[PDB]
Amino acid sequence: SDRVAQLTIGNSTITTQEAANIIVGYGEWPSYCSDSDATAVDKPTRPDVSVNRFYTLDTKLWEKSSKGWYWKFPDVLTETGVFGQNAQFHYLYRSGFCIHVQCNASKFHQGALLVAVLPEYVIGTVAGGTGTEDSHPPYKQTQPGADGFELQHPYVLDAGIPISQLTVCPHQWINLRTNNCATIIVPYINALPFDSALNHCNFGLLVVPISPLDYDQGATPVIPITITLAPMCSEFAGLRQAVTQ
Amino acid sequence: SDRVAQLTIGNSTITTQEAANIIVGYGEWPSYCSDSDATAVDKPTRPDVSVNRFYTLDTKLWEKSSKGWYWKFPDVLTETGVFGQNAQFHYLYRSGFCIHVQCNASKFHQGALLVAVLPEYVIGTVAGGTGTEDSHPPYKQTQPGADGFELQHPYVLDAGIPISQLTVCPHQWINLRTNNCATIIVPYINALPFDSALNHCNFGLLVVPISPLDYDQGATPVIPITITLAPMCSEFAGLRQAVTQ
Amino acid sequence: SDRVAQLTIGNSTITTQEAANIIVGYGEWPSYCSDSDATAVDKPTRPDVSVNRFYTLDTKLWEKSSKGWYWKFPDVLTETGVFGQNAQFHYLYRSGFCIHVQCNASKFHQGALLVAVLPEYVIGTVAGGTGTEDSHPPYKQTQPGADGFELQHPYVLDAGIPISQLTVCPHQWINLRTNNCATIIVPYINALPFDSALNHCNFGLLVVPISPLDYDQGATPVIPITITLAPMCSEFAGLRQAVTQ
Amino acid sequence: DRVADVIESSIGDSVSRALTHALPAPTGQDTQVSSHRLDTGKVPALQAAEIGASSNASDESMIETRCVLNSHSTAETTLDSFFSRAGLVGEIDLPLKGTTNPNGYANWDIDITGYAQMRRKVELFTYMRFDAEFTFVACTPTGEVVPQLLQYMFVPPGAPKPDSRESLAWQTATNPSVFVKLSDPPAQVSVPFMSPASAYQWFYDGYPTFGEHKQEKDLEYGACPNNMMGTFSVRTVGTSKSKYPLVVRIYMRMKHVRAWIPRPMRNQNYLFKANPNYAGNSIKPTGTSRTAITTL
Amino acid sequence: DRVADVIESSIGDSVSRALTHALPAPTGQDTQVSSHRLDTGKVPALQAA
């Protein structure tokens, strides 16, 4: 019962036969803003079925020597479909999310992944290697887009914090022995009721192989990883021209 | 629950641990003839346990290049036991059937079979190859006996009709990935309440490999197919001498 | 449900995920002696949690040419911990037992073991080979200790009785295809309410491979067997000096 | 009955146990409102085709839908709506000089398998039970209508078939007969269900005679005597030869139709009547073809 | 609102559904008496991380 699952939202569907339940982040579901919390006067727009549906970004290959990857939200979807058009036409933004990560292998492969969500994941630099140079990461590293970015020092999470305590954040595991998917549901997390989708990133998604991949020669050596996500309870306000930058 | 099954009729038993439910053809169970339907005056005989039991005909080998086979009913059982003796001693015949097909392999083999029942399966010829010669199939092809016969043009079912529409008939699949048996129950199908068992064949059984068999060298290369059947609610009338032809 | 099990007694725990239920020998549970049965006047001692807990004796390797092994109870535990100290400080002894045998392999190995409990398992000799010499087995064979002893003639059970009738005793099987553990619970079996733990052995445990071990070259060739046991409802009486012999 | 094997026996139960039943359905089914679902244990999409049954997934399970009221009628797909349309089933030619029917009379055995358009429709089922309606259209080879008297006689099996234009069998004292002119509108009549069985069958897997079935008796395979309904005979009413050549066309329309046990439709070209024979060398696929599966 | 997509719609629900709730806990939790168990089907030790 807990192994098979189906997720239906909008005009898209996902079916899986090897699952480990669904994590609801911080024990809260996405919802709309109330009148007490709201501050702006103009009424927002709620396009519903055209923006709350599953999107797939890209496929990444798992090697025996991989470090890890990370993505930024909602920076991935600012160029994809009606959600992207609405996000770059309006000034204010709010929504939840549903994240589904897929990776499958055989019964003779082994490995393990940690999939976690960290709000306000600020990226630091190596400070020139000696701590003397006060540099800042380029725009490519801070907001990599829908292609993601690969970690350089996964032990410190590229920010000076240990990875062994990342389980305090909403997370799941993908153990090739047990399951082949991970599902996490995230509400809207911010200190403001609305915010800009082009200047602020709410959180980040981390996929780090804790236990390395292994297999015997003769089996399939290509083990892809695919990311699928869907906004939930999206709201927009502050209509103006369309700005991309 | 739906995977394990047991079939008990007469003094024979069949046990299976990999099944896909039981198909009851046309949503009807075998039964005896009523007084309104009956036409003959003499009372029929119902030997019961001596004729309603499982019979196994023969074993056929599945190769990588097989075409398919077909059997004719009740022509297979006209020479086997008390059922055969009763069928060749009386003039009129009626009964249902229960068909069980068995084929097992390992977890590294692949393939698929289509098992279907087609009433009044008339066999045509290739008409000399040009459609000019009005030939008819020999008695060997029309009623092959208990040894069956191999199809020559499985695409047209040796009768000028497509195989892709054979699923309209009561049918099951034997997918080596999922199951290893198929069970079909057929009532008495005819436009008459009684008929001769030596001149008329009610239907035919088709076993055609849609997806070819495959395996790696080193595994077992012999994959047999066995047919088991049992009459249900048999009736005979019109006692006379014993004729075989 | 019947496959997974947990056994908790004292400060020790055993978890298994491949089991075949628990056998309760002779349909009776261990219990304490009643006033009608008791004969001695001094009150016994019941240390409880310090003696009723799981003990592991040793690991024995299963080869393609193994004969079998046997252990004697409670002779194995007369030198282990608080149970041994109590047994060698007092004169009278009584208790039940719980026996757990573990042996695991892969899905490509095959074999079978018979685990049985035989009360008053007296050992005979080969009588010099001709039946002329009235010899007796040495103390090493009669009470081998916690290391066990290997059978020389498993067909006659080293006592002149057939092995094919050993199933009349409380027993289980360890089929490498089905399960990997066997659990048996034995009450106190004797014609007296109390007895000496240093002169009398209540029963013996037999592990005999009926179907030999087999595997293909390249798999793991070391297949160990481990024995775990725990006394139940232990009682001691007749305190004196500590004697070991 | 004393032994407790006869009392408990199920022998003699003539009632048919039906798993299913028919329900009224004049229009197509509606569609109801559905929303998103995120749950474990409910998988309408995942199916198992090895069972032998069709998929039970619906619109509402897979996507989010709206409430739609369907009023489309299903009355055009019934059997009477599908089969009660006249089609050509036979043709008779009566020439002045020729080799086929030069003497002024002809005999036609009643059959439907002569023309492909109606044969393919009727051979979708195995058993069929219906009434008939035959219409006879008569004219010259060029279509011109000329003054002439014709007679049609229906000859049931066993009756003596006429052998000449002046045969004694044309007294039609018992067999029904029709006298009609070529200037009249086409004649048409009604025909009942005459089979000794309970339904006509287009496929008969067996032989009609007892004894050994050799290779010189192979033209009897598949022949069902219950479908041979007789002979249709036609002549020009007179003693001398007629002045004009004539052609007769027969159209038949079913009514009060019942059918059983559907089967796959014909795939190859027809070669002979009452014969499933096909051309061996030229077997063609069911449909068209394309160059690649990854393109259109 | 007439079409039966707006009436049934969940849009506009501003209340947060909480799976959990807070309970009073001034002191640490107690420990109760337990005995031995020998059963099949109950495995508190086996987990799935």
Ligand SMILES: CCCCCCCCCCCCC/C=C\[C@H](O)[C@H](N)CO
């Ligand atoms: C003046 C009356 C002329 C009558 C014309 C012929 C009427 C007889 C019709 C008989 C019933 C028609 C249906 C025949 C049976 C099957 O359809 C065919 N044998 C199929 O091959």
